[PDB]
Amino acid sequence: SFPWLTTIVVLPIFAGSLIFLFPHRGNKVIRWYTICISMIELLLMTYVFFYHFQPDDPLIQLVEDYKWINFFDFHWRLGIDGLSIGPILLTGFITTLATLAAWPVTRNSQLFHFLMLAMYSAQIGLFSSRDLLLFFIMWELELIPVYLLLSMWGGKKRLYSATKFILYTAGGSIFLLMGVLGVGLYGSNEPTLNLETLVNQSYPVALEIIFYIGFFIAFAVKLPIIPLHTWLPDTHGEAHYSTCMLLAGILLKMGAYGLVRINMELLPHAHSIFSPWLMIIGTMQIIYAASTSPGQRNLKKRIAYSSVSHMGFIIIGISSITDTGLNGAILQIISHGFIGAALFFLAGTSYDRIRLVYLDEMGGIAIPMPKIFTLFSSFSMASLALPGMSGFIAELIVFFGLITSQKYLLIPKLLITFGMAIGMILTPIYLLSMSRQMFYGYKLFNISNSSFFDSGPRELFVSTSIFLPVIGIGVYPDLVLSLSVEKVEAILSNYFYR
Amino acid sequence: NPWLDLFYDGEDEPETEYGSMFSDGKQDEDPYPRDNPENPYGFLKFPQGYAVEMASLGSKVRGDVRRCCCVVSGGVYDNLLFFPAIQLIKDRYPGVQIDIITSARGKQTYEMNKNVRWATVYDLDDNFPDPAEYTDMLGLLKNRYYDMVLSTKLAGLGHAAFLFMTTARDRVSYVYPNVNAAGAGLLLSETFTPDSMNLSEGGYNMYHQMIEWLGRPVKDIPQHLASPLKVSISRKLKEAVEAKYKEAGAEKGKYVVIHGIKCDSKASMQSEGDTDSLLPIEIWAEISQAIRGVTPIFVIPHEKLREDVEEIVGEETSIVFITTPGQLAALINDSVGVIATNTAAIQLALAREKPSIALFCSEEKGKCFVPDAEGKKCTVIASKTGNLADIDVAVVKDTLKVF
Amino acid sequence: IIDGIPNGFGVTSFFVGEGIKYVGGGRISSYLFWYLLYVSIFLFIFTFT
Amino acid sequence: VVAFLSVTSKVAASASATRIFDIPFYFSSNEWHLLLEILAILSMILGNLIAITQTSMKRMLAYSSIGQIGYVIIGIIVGDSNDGYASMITYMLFYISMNLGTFACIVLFGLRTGTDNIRDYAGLYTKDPFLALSLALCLLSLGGLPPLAGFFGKIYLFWCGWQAGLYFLVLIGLLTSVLSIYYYLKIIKLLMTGRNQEITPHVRNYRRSPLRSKNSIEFSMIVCVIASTIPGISMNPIITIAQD
Amino acid sequence: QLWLDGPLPGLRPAENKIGNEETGTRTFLKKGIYMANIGTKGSALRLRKYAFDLLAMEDLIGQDTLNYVRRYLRFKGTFMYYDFDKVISAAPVADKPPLTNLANRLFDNFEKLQEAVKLKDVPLTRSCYDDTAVTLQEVMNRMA
Amino acid sequence: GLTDIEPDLNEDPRDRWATNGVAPEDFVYGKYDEHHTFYESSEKGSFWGAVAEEYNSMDPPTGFQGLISWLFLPAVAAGMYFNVPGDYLFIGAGLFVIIFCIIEMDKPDQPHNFEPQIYNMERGARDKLIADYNTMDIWDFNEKYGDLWDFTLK
Numbered sequence A: 001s002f003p004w005l006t007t008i009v010v011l012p013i014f015a016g017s018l019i020f021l022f023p024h025r026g027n028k029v030i031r032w033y034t035i036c037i038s039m040i041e042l043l044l045m046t047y048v049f050f051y052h053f054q055p056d057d058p059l060i061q062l063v064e065d066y067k068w069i070n071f072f073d074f075h076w077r078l079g080i081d082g083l084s085i086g087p088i089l090l091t092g093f094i095t096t097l098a099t100l101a102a103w104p105v106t107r108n109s110q111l112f113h114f115l116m117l118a119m120y121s122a123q124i125g126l127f128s129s130r131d132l133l134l135f136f137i138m139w140e141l142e143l144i145p146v147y148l149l150l151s152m153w154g155g156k157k158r159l160y161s162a163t164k165f166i167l168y169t170a171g172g173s174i175f176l177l178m179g180v181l182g183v184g185l186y187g188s189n190e191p192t193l194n195l196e197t198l199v200n201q202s203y204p205v206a207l208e209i210i211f212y213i214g215f216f217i218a219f220a221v222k223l224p225i226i227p228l229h230t231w232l233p234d235t236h237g238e239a240h241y242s243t244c245m246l247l248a249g250i251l252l253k254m255g256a257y258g259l260v261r262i263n264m265e266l267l268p269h270a271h272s273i274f275s276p277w278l279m280i281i282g283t284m285q286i287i288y289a290a291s292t293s294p295g296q297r298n299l300k301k302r303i304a305y306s307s308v309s310h311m312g313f314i315i316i317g318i319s320s321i322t323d324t325g326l327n328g329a330i331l332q333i334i335s336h337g338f339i340g341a342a343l344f345f346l347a348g349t350s351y352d353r354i355r356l357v358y359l360d361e362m363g364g365i366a367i368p369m370p371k372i373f374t375l376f377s378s379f380s381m382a383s384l385a386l387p388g389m390s391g392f393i394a395e396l397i398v399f400f401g402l403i404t405s406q407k408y409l410l411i412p413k414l415l416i417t418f419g420m421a422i423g424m425i426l427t428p429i430y431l432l433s434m435s436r437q438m439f440y441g442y443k444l445f446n447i448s449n450s451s452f453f454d455s456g457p458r459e460l461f462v463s464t465s466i467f468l469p470v471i472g473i474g475v476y477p478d479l480v481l482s483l484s485v486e487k488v489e490a491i492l493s494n495y496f497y498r
Numbered sequence B: 001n002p003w004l005d006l007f008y009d010g011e012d013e014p015e016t017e018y019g020s021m022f023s024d025g026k027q028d029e030d031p032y033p034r035d036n037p038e039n040p041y042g043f044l045k046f047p048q049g050y051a052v053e054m055a056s057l058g059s060k061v062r063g064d065v066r067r068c069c070c071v072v073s074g075g076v077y078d079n080l081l082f083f084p085a086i087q088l089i090k091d092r093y094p095g096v097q098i099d100i101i102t103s104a105r106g107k108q109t110y111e112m113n114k115n116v117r118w119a120t121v122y123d124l125d126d127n128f129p130d131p132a133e134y135t136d137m138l139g140l141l142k143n144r145y146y147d148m149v150l151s152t153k154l155a156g157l158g159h160a161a162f163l164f165m166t167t168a169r170d171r172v173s174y175v176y177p178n179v180n181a182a183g184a185g186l187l188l189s190e191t192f193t194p195d196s197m198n199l200s201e202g203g204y205n206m207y208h209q210m211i212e213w214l215g216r217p218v219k220d221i222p223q224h225l226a227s228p229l230k231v232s233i234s235r236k237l238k239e240a241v242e243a244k245y246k247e248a249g250a251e252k253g254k255y256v257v258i259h260g261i262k263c264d265s266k267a268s269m270q271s272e273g274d275t276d277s278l279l280p281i282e283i284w285a286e287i288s289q290a291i292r293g294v295t296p297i298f299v300i301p302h303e304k305l306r307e308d309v310e311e312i313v314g315e316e317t318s319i320v321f322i323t324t325p326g327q328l329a330a331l332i333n334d335s336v337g338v339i340a341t342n343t344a345a346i347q348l349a350l351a352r353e354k355p356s357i358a359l360f361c362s363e364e365k366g367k368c369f370v371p372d373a374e375g376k377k378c379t380v381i382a383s384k385t386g387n388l389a390d391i392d393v394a395v396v397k398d399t400l401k402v403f
Numbered sequence C: 001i002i003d004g005i006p007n008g009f010g011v012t013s014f015f016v017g018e019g020i021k022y023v024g025g026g027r028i029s030s031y032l033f034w035y036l037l038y039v040s041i042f043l044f045i046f047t048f049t
Numbered sequence D: 001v002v003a004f005l006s007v008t009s010k011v012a013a014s015a016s017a018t019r020i021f022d023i024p025f026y027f028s029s030n031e032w033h034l035l036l037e038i039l040a041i042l043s044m045i046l047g048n049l050i051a052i053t054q055t056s057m058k059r060m061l062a063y064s065s066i067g068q069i070g071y072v073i074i075g076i077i078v079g080d081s082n083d084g085y086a087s088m089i090t091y092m093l094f095y096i097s098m099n100l101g102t103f104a105c106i107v108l109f110g111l112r113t114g115t116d117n118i119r120d121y122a123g124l125y126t127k128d129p130f131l132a133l134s135l136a137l138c139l140l141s142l143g144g145l146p147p148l149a150g151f152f153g154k155i156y157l158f159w160c161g162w163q164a165g166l167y168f169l170v171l172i173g174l175l176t177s178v179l180s181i182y183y184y185l186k187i188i189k190l191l192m193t194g195r196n197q198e199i200t201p202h203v204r205n206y207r208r209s210p211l212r213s214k215n216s217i218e219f220s221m222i223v224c225v226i227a228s229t230i231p232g233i234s235m236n237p238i239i240t241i242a243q244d
Numbered sequence E: 001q002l003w004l005d006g007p008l009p010g011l012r013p014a015e016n017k018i019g020n021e022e023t024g025t026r027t028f029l030k031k032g033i034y035m036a037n038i039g040t041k042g043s044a045l046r047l048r049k050y051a052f053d054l055l056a057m058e059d060l061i062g063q064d065t066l067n068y069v070r071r072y073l074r075f076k077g078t079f080m081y082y083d084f085d086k087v088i089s090a091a092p093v094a095d096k097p098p099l100t101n102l103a104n105r106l107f108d109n110f111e112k113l114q115e116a117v118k119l120k121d122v123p124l125t126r127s128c129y130d131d132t133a134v135t136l137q138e139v140m141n142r143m144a
Numbered sequence F: 001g002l003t004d005i006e007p008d009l010n011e012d013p014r015d016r017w018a019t020n021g022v023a024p025e026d027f028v029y030g031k032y033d034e035h036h037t038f039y040e041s042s043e044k045g046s047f048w049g050a051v052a053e054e055y056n057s058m059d060p061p062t063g064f065q066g067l068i069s070w071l072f073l074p075a076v077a078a079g080m081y082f083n084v085p086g087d088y089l090f091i092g093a094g095l096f097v098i099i100f101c102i103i104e105m106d107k108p109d110q111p112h113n114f115e116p117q118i119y120n121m122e123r124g125a126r127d128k129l130i131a132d133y134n135t136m137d138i139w140d141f142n143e144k145y146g147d148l149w150d151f152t153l154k
């Protein structure tokens, strides 16, 4: 009866709108108020997941429907299931930790924390939206906060990166809007935008293919798909590391979530048509990004291309029409949200001390900064698909989903299985080299770098608190999969003969 | 040409007045808009009748510039020789902010310049730049909102288009004398055709056409000329080079600066119009053997040459490693004389009014590069065969008593 | 190659915008002539052909 | 006066065009439909492309107005059947507030400053955060940014265009709206420069003064409208589909 | 050929009449499960092994873990259903009726266990699983 | 880093893939690598003394804040073990978060909390600023040192 999801969506942006009533200077009160709001919201989502979400239910849960515009038949409609609660919890966790890690920011702290809370609200509103136009609105609601965060707290090339990001996202999202208009106006009697009634809609093959292309262009601009990935390297490389958490851990997974929710669920026939061509694209994306990563002298650009490489396993699990492949895609979503954010955070904190960019001049950092060396090595191992971490089990489950797939027969099933395997040969080749060019060797450092130079309690806590779920999922993957084994099956139930 | 500007109707009539305000004078003379402390809302004091927005009127009527972009091609020598043009821009347009685009080596020249706001590094010699870097530089130039842009680089169609997309009111450039610069003048407000495919082939007055265009008398403003080359050295450069030459053993006001030792280093500060401006270390040792009472300091642009000097002139000599032109100018400032081949050292000696000896490969290069050597305390010793290694050490030994 | 497409889009947009801005002239006679040429073109299109 | 001629001239001319193309010229709809389609496509293409190369604020707003008029022309083109004239209004009502706010901020900035060039808008956030916030909100509403009036107005204008089968017009409108972000973001990019060397002396000597002034009330009746009409886009259309 | 064009094939009907009489198929069957093709000997070995795996499910039966009981039951039930079909189809004609009767009793026990799990009744689940346990022990004794 | 003097440009190229440390022939083995640089000492401090020193160096919350921060996690673990209702746990966690954040807002401000312009003024003026900001109300501070936050004024 109580509007839980509406309260969860509204609370961060509504609380951040009141951050301008504070007449205090500095950043202390602003950052403590922002972390209070973030932790209260996190506890609210924890209560919702604990007491009102049932992982055994394949249906929509905690639905809320309020008619907002009559002409479009447009409703503020919210609802969660096994697909959305994982991204919602990840969004809350990563956004709270990014607010905590953005504490040295003393320039325009009020606007920074307001934009962080706005990003919180927009991501949560996207992940819990059951209306197509509401989905599009929540998709669009992050162009301005990320643009401002990039252009006001980014790197050397922040302005060009922000312009490229906003223009690329608008270019994808106009195709998203065209797909929304096409799907929502297909009704013979009246327009409809609810996903529940749209999941039973029947389209001709050509119109379904056109709608799939219209949605897929947007979901390939957002989730990096070759060759619509060029915004990502300069956007993530020249962004603040706290913003890089949201960019590489949350915003990248939104394209995959839209692919499951819309392309995979609403339009199954066009998805079955397009998936074998998506498999080759994902494998070539893995190889292409894992080969582009050694060519990048910049550390953050290398990490961004690593993120592009890791998105290929999600693409494969999407295109492999099995329950196991979709479960592996969700597991890789969670694993990458836990790995890329921490890697970007460590890179930013290390740059705040070393103040160097290109890898060929950052030797010997392990001598003054051993703890950040340890965390960087551990998160590289997590990136390396090492067992005991979530990445290995995610890639293994994706491999199993391909092997167990019934759509493909033998030879492609070989040539793709070999394919990503080449990727996990290329993934060490730069990553360890990165460490070898960033921590190994001897350099004579200043005496002032002997003390008060390593990561403090806050950075250690952030890295540990993102590292622990990685180990917890790599040991017991069903800490995540059990939330979405049922709903994924329902998503697969439309892909078989009926 | 009639087909481009249709409805031309000639030039302006002699009796046109262009209004009253923002009509004559310079940028620092405008009396309106002025502060209004008696206004309760903070609005300024505006003249009767005139619209509130008046700062845009000076650009249209008087042609005022407030931000200028000089895209200077070349290394240290060309960017150093562009200093009188920058001073001319500052004098003609009071309150202007001048930004420089140049190479990595030429950006260090503007350390000793008091007029440049921003100095930016951009690979101008690359005809096929990175699309991201090119777009970022173009957007940066667009966002600086330059009133006028000047280009010493010989501009084809591509460079003309790059200057065109800068949104500058005046686009002025040097163009290629060949047929490959066709259509470049359409996209540029003003075009200059040099006498050769290399602009650095001209000497100290290589930018003479740009100087004439900058100081032309327009609308009761008198003609502005180019000042002699000057540099300003900060205290940090002085302290650094003082430590550098105190490690070499020399002291203040008791040493001379020798420049132009032959090597493959790119920090030799040569000119593109004089590729022969290098002398071998043996001839330098022969010349420096004749110095008495003043400690000769050899300036090497690379440390790998140092040991070579230590086995040519002697192990007990004074060697100073200089790569940044500010440090070279600061070394020249504390010296008493400069024995230099045709590098930037002789120009910095001219800037600091030090008596100096210039060794040139030819007499024509000597008169073109330093046209007033006799007035500015310099003797030009030019080789009579056109080859610098064929210079005669006897004349230099005789002339070395000026210190 | 791949990154040249969006930056090329931006550069061509800038160049075409600058060209259209600079091609007119800003004179009133040019304004009237361009305003009337398209009227003549519309009249020839919709009546003659 | 130019703000007046930006909002008052387009309303009256839109009314005259609607009452002169529907009542006395309905028999030849296939001709003025093509004329208006050309007139709108060229308008968006050549009003959004030239606005990104502007160094003056009023001229950039001029190209902005001649770009936004093409979105409204789609309402005439689709006709009264698939809403249409109900999408002319509920966007012109938006457009009035958008332009009058973005001109009131310009009026106050010019009066306290004495300039019109865009390059002198740098660092206004440090001097007057309220004016910079209001101008940024007006410009983002002009660009059709999501939580502001222009976005819902444009999706209302495009819903009727798609419903009438005008895919080309809606596609050109969306592409030109993407082009229409670089400006309305360039001014904000200037407004958030903390570099004191890039700040023009025009805003360095800026006095906000401890009085309200009339334009502040007039644009506080506006900035709170272009943002808080975004829920109230169900009350407006039921007054605009009621007409026929 | 590289990939299938239409929708993926569903539950293939058994040709040994081991399904439900009214419907022709069993409720615990799950579509999309990859069954490796080994043959009659491999199907018998997998049948015995998966009967042991389902007899390893005493610990999973509880008030809190009935959903995992249902999931494991559906997975292993599909596996042993198609393995039983394979081994009956290749059995000698004299041995087909007893094998079919044993399979029918085992799958009826599977349905009863799934029905007990659905109502979240633990004593009913325990009794139905005890009947399933004696049937599975009979299955491994037959197929050793 | 930051250079007040334009640095000498790199004339000779360097391999991108090479290790950035010193050359193996210039490596002082046993010293540069900490392999023979730990000689024991009878003067080894207490283990719990080291624990207390490391904990106190982090500047822990003290008093009621220290009490709740110490007692939060064991209370949550005990409540989850004793099968107490979880709504009480959520209420307690929210109350702890709000109380902790309010107490932290009540704590005085340090020089590092402000802008680099405020940090890099005259040290005596900065000390007077910090002393006033923690003493008078925020409105009096804003009406007295407001113009110091207009960074374009100077």
Ligand SMILES: CC1=C(/C=C/C(C)=C/C=C/C(C)=C/C=C\C=C(C)\C=C\C=C(C)\C=C\C2=C(C)CCCC2(C)C)C(C)(C)CCC1
Binding pocket: A086, A089, A090, A093, A334, A374, A375, A378, A463, A464, A467, A468, A469, A470, A471, A472, A473, A479, A480
């Ligand atoms: C999904 C998700 C999640 C969850 C998670 C989980 C469920 C977790 C668990 C976990 C667990 C259940 C765990 C267990 C255990 C663990 C352990 C036992 C560990 C240990 C460790 C150690 C001892 C150490 C470590 C380290 C570090 C920290 C770093 C450096 C390196 C090293 C390795 C040394 C969350 C909520 C976040 C939110 C979002 C979503």
Ligand SMILES: CCC[C@H]1CC[C@H]([C@H]2CC[C@@H](O[C@@H]3O[C@H](CO)[C@@H](O[C@H]4O[C@H](CO)[C@@H](O)[C@H](O)[C@H]4O)[C@H](O)[C@H]3O)CC2)CC1
Binding pocket: B004, B005, B006, B186, B187, C015, C016, C018, C019, C020, C022, C023, C024, C025, C026
């Ligand atoms: C391929 C990209 C599209 C297109 C290609 C061609 C591009 C224009 C560029 C420039 C333009 O210039 C023409 O030349 C004239 C000079 O006389 C101008 O007239 C001036 O005259 C005065 C200076 O002489 C200025 O004060 C006036 O502002 C201006 O009128 C005239 O504008 C124009 O006809 C021709 C080709 C554009 C991009």
Ligand SMILES: CCC[C@H]1CC[C@H]([C@H]2CC[C@@H](O[C@@H]3O[C@H](CO)[C@@H](O[C@H]4O[C@H](CO)[C@@H](O)[C@H](O)[C@H]4O)[C@H](O)[C@H]3O)CC2)CC1
Binding pocket: F044, F045, F046, F047, F048
């Ligand atoms: C299953 C995991 C295996 C392993 C078991 C043993 C585990 C340690 C835990 C901690 C330590 O307890 C503490 O250690 C010391 C005892 O000797 C005393 O400390 C004094 O002796 C030290 C020995 O050198 C000195 O360094 C200290 O200065 C001095 O205070 C301390 O009382 C005692 O509390 C031993 C067992 C680890 C995991």
